[PDB]
Ligand binder design. Structure first.
Ligand SMILES: [Mg+2]
Ligand SMILES: [Mg+2]
Ligand SMILES: [Mg+2]
Ligand SMILES: [Mg+2]
Ligand SMILES: [Mg+2]
Ligand SMILES: [Mg+2]
Ligand SMILES: [Mg+2]
Ligand SMILES: [Mg+2]
Ligand SMILES: [Mg+2]
Ligand SMILES: [Mg+2]
Ligand SMILES: [Mg+2]
Ligand SMILES: [Mg+2]
Ligand SMILES: [Mg+2]
Ligand SMILES: [Mg+2]
Ligand SMILES: [Mg+2]
Ligand SMILES: [Mg+2]
Ligand SMILES: [Mg+2]
Ligand SMILES: [Mg+2]
Ligand SMILES: [Mg+2]
Ligand SMILES: [Mg+2]
Ligand SMILES: [Mg+2]
Ligand SMILES: [Mg+2]
Ligand SMILES: [Mg+2]
Ligand SMILES: [Mg+2]
Ligand SMILES: [Mg+2]
Ligand SMILES: [Mg+2]
Ligand SMILES: [Mg+2]
Ligand SMILES: [Mg+2]
Ligand SMILES: [Mg+2]
Ligand SMILES: [Mg+2]
Ligand SMILES: [Mg+2]
Ligand SMILES: [Mg+2]
Ligand SMILES: [Mg+2]
Ligand SMILES: [Mg+2]
Ligand SMILES: [Mg+2]
Ligand SMILES: [Mg+2]
Ligand SMILES: [Mg+2]
Ligand SMILES: [Mg+2]
Ligand SMILES: [Mg+2]
Ligand SMILES: [Mg+2]
Ligand SMILES: [Mg+2]
Ligand SMILES: [Mg+2]
Ligand SMILES: [Mg+2]
Ligand SMILES: [Mg+2]
Ligand SMILES: [Mg+2]
Ligand SMILES: [Mg+2]
Ligand SMILES: [Mg+2]
Ligand SMILES: [Mg+2]
Ligand SMILES: [Mg+2]
Ligand SMILES: [Mg+2]
Ligand SMILES: [Mg+2]
Ligand SMILES: [Mg+2]
Ligand SMILES: [Mg+2]
Ligand SMILES: [Mg+2]
Ligand SMILES: [Mg+2]
Ligand SMILES: [Mg+2]
Ligand SMILES: [Mg+2]
Ligand SMILES: [Mg+2]
Ligand SMILES: [Mg+2]
Ligand SMILES: [Mg+2]
Ligand SMILES: [Mg+2]
Ligand SMILES: [Mg+2]
Ligand SMILES: [Mg+2]
Ligand SMILES: [Mg+2]
Ligand SMILES: [Mg+2]
Ligand SMILES: [Mg+2]
Ligand SMILES: [Mg+2]
Ligand SMILES: [Mg+2]
Ligand SMILES: [Mg+2]
Ligand SMILES: [Mg+2]
Ligand SMILES: [Mg+2]
Ligand SMILES: [Mg+2]
Ligand SMILES: [Mg+2]
Ligand SMILES: [Mg+2]
Ligand SMILES: [Mg+2]
Ligand SMILES: [Mg+2]
Ligand SMILES: [Mg+2]
Ligand SMILES: [Mg+2]
Ligand SMILES: [Mg+2]
Ligand SMILES: [Mg+2]
Ligand SMILES: [Mg+2]
Ligand SMILES: [Mg+2]
Ligand SMILES: [Mg+2]
Ligand SMILES: [Mg+2]
Ligand SMILES: [Mg+2]
Ligand SMILES: [Mg+2]
Ligand SMILES: [Mg+2]
Ligand SMILES: [Mg+2]
Ligand SMILES: [Mg+2]
Ligand SMILES: [Mg+2]
Ligand SMILES: [Mg+2]
Length: 61
RNA sequence: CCGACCCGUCUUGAAACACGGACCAAGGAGUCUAACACGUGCGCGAGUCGGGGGCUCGCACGAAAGCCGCCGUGGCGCAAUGAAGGUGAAGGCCGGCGCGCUCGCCGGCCGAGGUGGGAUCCCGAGGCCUCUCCAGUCCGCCGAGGGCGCACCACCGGCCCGUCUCGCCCGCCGCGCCGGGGAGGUGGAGCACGAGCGCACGUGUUAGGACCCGAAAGAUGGUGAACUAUGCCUGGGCAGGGCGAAGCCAGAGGAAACUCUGGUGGAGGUCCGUAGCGGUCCUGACGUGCAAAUCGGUCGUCCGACCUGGGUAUAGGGGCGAAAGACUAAUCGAACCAUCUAGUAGCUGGUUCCCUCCGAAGUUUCCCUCAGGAUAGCUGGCGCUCUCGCAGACCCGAGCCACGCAGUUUUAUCCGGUAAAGCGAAUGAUUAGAGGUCUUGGGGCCGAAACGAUCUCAACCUAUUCUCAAACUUUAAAUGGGUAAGAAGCCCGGCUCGCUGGCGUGGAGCCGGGCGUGGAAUGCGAGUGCCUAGUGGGCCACUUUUGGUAAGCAGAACUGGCGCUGCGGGAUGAACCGAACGCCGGGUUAAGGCGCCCGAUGCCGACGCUCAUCAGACCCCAGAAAAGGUGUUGGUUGAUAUAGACAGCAGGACGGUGGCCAUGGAAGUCGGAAUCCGCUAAGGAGUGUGUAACAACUCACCUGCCGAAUCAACUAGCCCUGAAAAUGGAU
RNA sequence: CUACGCCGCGACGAGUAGGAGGGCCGCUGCGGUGAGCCUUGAAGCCUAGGGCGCGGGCCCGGGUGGAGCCGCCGCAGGUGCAGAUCUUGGUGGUAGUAGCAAAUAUUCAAACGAGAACUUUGAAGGCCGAAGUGGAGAAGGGUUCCAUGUGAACAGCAGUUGA
RNA sequence: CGGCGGGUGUUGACGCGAUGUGAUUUCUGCCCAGUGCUCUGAAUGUCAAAGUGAAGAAAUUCAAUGAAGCGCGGGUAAACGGCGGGAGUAACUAUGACUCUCUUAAGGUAGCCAAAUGCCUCGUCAUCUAAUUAGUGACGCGCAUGAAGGAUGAACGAGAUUCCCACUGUCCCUACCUACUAUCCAGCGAAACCACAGCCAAGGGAACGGGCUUGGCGGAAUCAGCGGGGAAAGAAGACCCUG
RNA sequence: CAGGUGGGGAGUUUGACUGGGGCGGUACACCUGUCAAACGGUAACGCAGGUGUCCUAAGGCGAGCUCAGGGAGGACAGAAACCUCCCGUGGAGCAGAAGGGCAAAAGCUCGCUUGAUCUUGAUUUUCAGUACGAAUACAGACCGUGAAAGCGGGGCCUCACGAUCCUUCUGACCUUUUGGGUUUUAAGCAGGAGGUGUCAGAAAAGUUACCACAGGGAUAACUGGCUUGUGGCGGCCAAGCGUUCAUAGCGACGUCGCUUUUUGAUCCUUCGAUGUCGGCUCUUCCUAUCAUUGUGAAGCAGAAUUCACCAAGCGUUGGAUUGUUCACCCACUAAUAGGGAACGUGAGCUGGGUUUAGACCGUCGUGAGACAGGUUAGUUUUACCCUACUGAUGAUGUGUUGUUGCCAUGGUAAUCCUGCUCAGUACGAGAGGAACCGCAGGUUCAGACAUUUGGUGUAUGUGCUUGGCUGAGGAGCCAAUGGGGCGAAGCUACCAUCUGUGGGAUUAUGACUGAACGCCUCUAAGUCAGAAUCCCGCCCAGGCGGAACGAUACGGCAGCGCCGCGGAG
RNA sequence: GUCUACGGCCAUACCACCCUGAACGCGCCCGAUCUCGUCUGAUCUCGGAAGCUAAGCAGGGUCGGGCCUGGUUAGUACUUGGAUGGGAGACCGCCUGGGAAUACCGGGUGCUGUAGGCUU
């Protein structure tokens, strides 16, 4: 009739059998969720980043 | 000799007083079809596939195999997106004019962009050679650095379809409520130089009998009234007695009315009681029977609603019922037969060869969910992407030493409100005095009179005081949780922006360049994908912990274990202690032991404690408390004593005063208070016994004998009392 | 050096539910193959016989048997049993046991016969006691009726008797 | 199922059909609010299809009209059923003849009772006995009696109960006898049941062992009994829960 | 065809959790504090509570103020009316439960308003990292307020809520409406609403004792096990009672235990079944002893009684009522003690009760039906197996066989009362009133026995007798023992009769001597007495235990014993 | 050495009382025509400059309260890990590491940024 209601016994062992892996950190974290206004200006900056290539190459030279 | 409980099964737990199993032989349970998904093998490959048809002596095989190609119709793939109308996946650079106006017409190129990683490949300064050198003949190896970068991953851009917001243009045989564009967000199972198709095999899920066996039921169509129930037809049957209804006859008594008496008669759902029919009690017999309802005795009725044969009628959700849900062929709260039907089952039982490797869960969320599923977790299988190097034919390295990871520490840096602590800190609770001056405190001895007064109790205030808190708190641990400890870092410049803006401002992005002592310890090779079974009843122990008197109770946290696990020890034992396991030999241990059972103390083991007429004897653990002991052993504190202890024996133990008041006597001793002095060595105006009260004993106080240590109160070891249960018995 | 082979070094080995691999483990049938085996003896069965393998299992000897069978490479299954109050068949212990006890009752002699408690005849003693244990029918049975013969089985002992 | 089909019905209210109660005797009280049943529509509320009218191009929409039924209103309790409270009130208290009220409608009349109906209860009182949770009689604010069923009343009953006489082996308290068994023999010859089996104490253990541990111990093969055990057999518990 | 009626009939349903289920409750969807063990998470029908709403302002801005309370003043005015000053860290208020938060605030009073509006995404919370709900940060419009910075897309924060399908409304000069076109209609796209509270969301009343099936010891009713609140029985302290005096006998306030003979709590075993109350019968065990034996104490003069010790050997009864266990009464008694053994005991019985099916009453229910309410009637099966036990043969071994024996071991048995005498004695003022020895008998029990008395009697012994039968007499028989009187033997009855037993060590206890502790002391060493107990005797059986003794195989080849170390094996 | 305006940290800064304040400043102060608000020019707003440090403010003082920081409390309480340690239990001791809080007793009583003044 009545049964055990809840337990976390053995759960920690189950969690550590395959290890509790941290999230896979890597370069270039995603841009989703960032402020839309700042994001659209960043897109504009990237689009127009091509112009001034001659100036950048002359300065580098 | 040692070890050894009976297997299977469900179960937290089986040798179980849990179920199945007397024995043996043969049979006996995950199959086939279809549809999916993924993996693997094969062929072809932007294709692929003839499976349906046809052609080929119509045929032993051959119902096969071979071929078709204007039989590829068609299926699947090659294009997506939208409800739909419909629409429908190529960018980059280099130039001139419009204003190179976030840009329109073209040119000329290349043909899916870029960043960071990236196996492999390429170049490579410099090194390696011999009998030797100044000077080159040719190829092999190592090699710092640099380059092109597969697949794949992360990110940023771009393209297609839907849908919003904004805004300016363009096109025309239809100038329109027409058509087409652009920018910025956002929705898509998309594009971004295809990977599919067919066949085979495996695994998983599913629909089908669906691993095998199993309901109570439901439906369709039939067979039964030979038993019984009831109606009808036509037959048969029921000793002997008792009571004595109406009708009738006679006699008697009566003034009459009429009454009485004796016969006769033979009624009755009448009585006793055969046969018949039934079936009360013995709760008799029997109870694997004579019998799937019988037998013995005892019983009910026995002229009637009586018993009975045969013939008939009523048939299943129907009949029939003097009614019990009774009876309807040993079947009735819905007969029997066949079929649908191998009905369904979240439930029970079973489920067939060996070895090897890996190896669980009883938890999360949802469910008319609680004996079940889905889901995540735990498992297995298949891989794939990388890292370290592999070394020298034998021999022989010639600061600096892998991508990365972690149930760990260290170094910094945060987080917390438990334990503890606190209440002369807040909020609640709570004890006691003290000191104060006001009051709707009671009031308060003589004060109405100005309580002339000021004594007391309250409340209040002040400074203290005792005790507390899971749902209080100033303070505040231990254990714990997060982050960081570099090349994705640090530092220099430069470019872009429509965001931001006093500003060469801020911020973000991008492009070059330089920095390597690789910036704690320790250990370890990592990353990533697909498919996936079983499980989803748990239980136990230390510690924390809630409810409960408690529980071998119920409920949580942490870790470990049992389940799933054998072995050594605990005599015995799922969980305790040690330790985890291939088959063996030698050595040594753990926990635990070493009188004998029974391996080992058969040591000239050490020091003590302890006697029990219920001794004691080892984690869990299998039994005990308060309170006692002049049993004994230690210890603590105090006290006395050669100015003579303690104990024994022997002396004294006096006056006021028979002290005050209680009285009926209380003289030291029933009592209420007081609590002295003189003689002293000592004497209490009294320790108890005692008396009516006295008296008499005796103490507390001194003295004599005795000559050396003694007394008291505690304390904690072992032992004893406390300590009573049922078959005879358990270190 | 059967490269699906051979060799070397190091570490490791518990296991239910469950997953996977290997099987020169086993059964049946099909395509190949063994110039396979076999009446000078196949399958099957039995065996204090000899062995191999961790094991599933297998080979060989002896006996019996009397006509078919197996190895290897592939293929395909109605392919492996201790259980299911399993299905069918057979067999034990129980066990020479329970039992052959309702309705009073048999005895003597003889015959037949291998054989007599049970048959038949005779003599006794009893019972049913006319609402019968008597004599005849209906339903139902279907040859049980009646003679002769047999002594297998049946008549829960026997039988010379019998439905 | 169906036919103007069929049963009652070869019938006709002294008859068929449907109910309740249950001979005789004696009574059968109050309640029509509820639920039923039934009766008249009295304007009258609601109320389908069809039909009618309007709008519309039509589909369609709207409106009017209003069958039965329900609703409204009467009757009905030998229809189902129900028959409680509260306030005041008599010259001892106490009760309430009397007067009012509330829920609905009426408040349990006549009778009967610790009854086969009463919990408390083994009620209280009388009787019966030495002793009575029994019996009878009586009382009655009766948990929760009661009138087509109440209260009686002869006869009857394989109905339930109590007492008395007689009678007895029911008992004190058992014994003996008979028949058939059982028993033994000749013949014949099953079945149930069966993991293996079968001596105990304690321990631990699924918390009551035949097996295990520690002890006690253990001597072929059997016969007649016996009913302590085998948590004996018989049946997949019928109680309880779940599905 | 339409409407009404329609359990006459059909089909179906009649939640879940749950210290069994039902009744109760909601721990079923949520929120606060605690539990919770200082990150987060964490359970029980854990604790204290709350929720299914309310608000055009209680939403949004801005401005200005300060709240609760207290002190001191002021006509009525007082503890509370209003006015003024001062103190006032919030001790108030913020809609509600609680917690957090808040002072020129988030509170109060005003002014203006509608950001409680139109949109796309992201994120947090529960989480599977699904949804809903709620929430956070942005972005794009359109606004409100303020001088402005700013703030606002509901409420200071933590809760206040809801899928598919369907319906309804709103929006796009939107899409489709099937050969084309127009118009109604319908379908669609996007967003609100109508709701599932069992709150991830079926459309749902009972009863069954006439019942059924698949199961469950996952789960109750009876045993057992853990526990011991409750029940029962004890202990410690001693305020008091006891004329006096705590403790002869008691024991308040407290406090420590034991028992499993009560009742609970739990749910470990059993649901392919462990027969469930009581009585009857019978055995054994416990002691917490009612009586009896031996004792100690007293508020013990005697008698009677009370308390305690060793102690379970022995006994603990006959009846009325009731099914009863209990209970109560009558009567006897030495006493009429309490318990266990699967609440001992159903293949031992009985079946009164509970607890099937029939039936009546009362109450409940519309009804079927229900009722730890009453009443009545209601099938009690099997042993032949194994062991246990009771008896009965046997078996091992001594060469065979017999007689006579011993005793290991096991069992074990006696009990209680009355009368006389002691003795009208001790004691006592008196009334009353014992005991030891001895004697005579009983009760219960045991073991026998049959002379006597009684019972039986099928000696089928002998008379009598009924009905029938053999022709009658005589003699008999049949009637399941025809009936009846008397009856031998045998068996048998407290229904007759006989018999029933000694010692030892000791317990409790009282003592001796005697230290410890120059005293005392039953104790420490050493001694004594001492009992229904214990052991043995007497009595019953006689070991896989012995002893002594006897006889030990032919009238025929036939066996055996002793002697020999005699031999060969 | 100070002040003013705006501040940062937010008591070492707060609170109670007393003393001192030169120069600027900050204030008190005067008034209501305008701006603007009131029951009230008290507040708010505005226009001023006779007087004053009386107050605010600043500095100082108090065996001051508080606050801040040390000591003591105390290696105490508590606690990680361990034992076949003790005890009938309740609980306690030890090993291994960590380690508080009152009461009581000391010291301290704002630091500072920007901009602008005064102080011989
Ligand atoms: Mg569970
Ligand atoms: Mg099972
Ligand atoms: Mg279980
Ligand atoms: Mg088992
Ligand atoms: Mg058991
Ligand atoms: Mg079972
Ligand atoms: Mg069986
Ligand atoms: Mg079987
Ligand atoms: Mg072909
Ligand atoms: Mg085509
Ligand atoms: Mg790349
Ligand atoms: Mg992208
Ligand atoms: Mg799948
Ligand atoms: Mg099947
Ligand atoms: Mg159905
Ligand atoms: Mg018939
Ligand atoms: Mg008659
Ligand atoms: Mg009669
Ligand atoms: Mg019977
Ligand atoms: Mg019935
Ligand atoms: Mg079936
Ligand atoms: Mg649901
Ligand atoms: Mg199960
Ligand atoms: Mg907390
Ligand atoms: Mg605390
Ligand atoms: Mg406090
Ligand atoms: Mg638990
Ligand atoms: Mg398991
Ligand atoms: Mg494991
Ligand atoms: Mg193990
Ligand atoms: Mg062991
Ligand atoms: Mg042990
Ligand atoms: Mg070894
Ligand atoms: Mg040992
Ligand atoms: Mg040894
Ligand atoms: Mg003791
Ligand atoms: Mg293994
Ligand atoms: Mg098969
Ligand atoms: Mg087989
Ligand atoms: Mg078999
Ligand atoms: Mg026999
Ligand atoms: Mg017999
Ligand atoms: Mg006769
Ligand atoms: Mg005849
Ligand atoms: Mg014949
Ligand atoms: Mg025969
Ligand atoms: Mg009638
Ligand atoms: Mg009408
Ligand atoms: Mg009327
Ligand atoms: Mg009345
Ligand atoms: Mg009554
Ligand atoms: Mg009665
Ligand atoms: Mg009686
Ligand atoms: Mg009466
Ligand atoms: Mg009436
Ligand atoms: Mg035993
Ligand atoms: Mg079952
Ligand atoms: Mg069943
Ligand atoms: Mg129905
Ligand atoms: Mg924690
Ligand atoms: Mg926490
Ligand atoms: Mg404000
Ligand atoms: Mg906005
Ligand atoms: Mg739900
Ligand atoms: Mg259980
Ligand atoms: Mg108690
Ligand atoms: Mg007194
Ligand atoms: Mg449990
Ligand atoms: Mg049974
Ligand atoms: Mg069983
Ligand atoms: Mg039994
Ligand atoms: Mg005793
Ligand atoms: Mg019993
Ligand atoms: Mg029995
Ligand atoms: Mg029985
Ligand atoms: Mg009965
Ligand atoms: Mg009944
Ligand atoms: Mg009867
Ligand atoms: Mg026999
Ligand atoms: Mg003896
Ligand atoms: Mg005796
Ligand atoms: Mg005669
Ligand atoms: Mg004669
Ligand atoms: Mg005759
Ligand atoms: Mg006769
Ligand atoms: Mg006689
Ligand atoms: Mg006698
Ligand atoms: Mg003594
Ligand atoms: Mg002596
Ligand atoms: Mg100070
Ligand atoms: Mg420590």
């Amino acid at each position: 009739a009545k049964s055990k209601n809840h337990t976390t016994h053995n759960q920690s062992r189950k969690w550590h059998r395959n290890g509790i892996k941290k999230p896979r950190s890597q370069r270039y974290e995603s841009l989703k969720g960032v402020d839309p206004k700042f994001l659209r200006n960043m897109r504009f900056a990237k689009k127009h980043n091509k112009k001034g290539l001659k100036k950048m190459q002359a300065n580098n030279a």
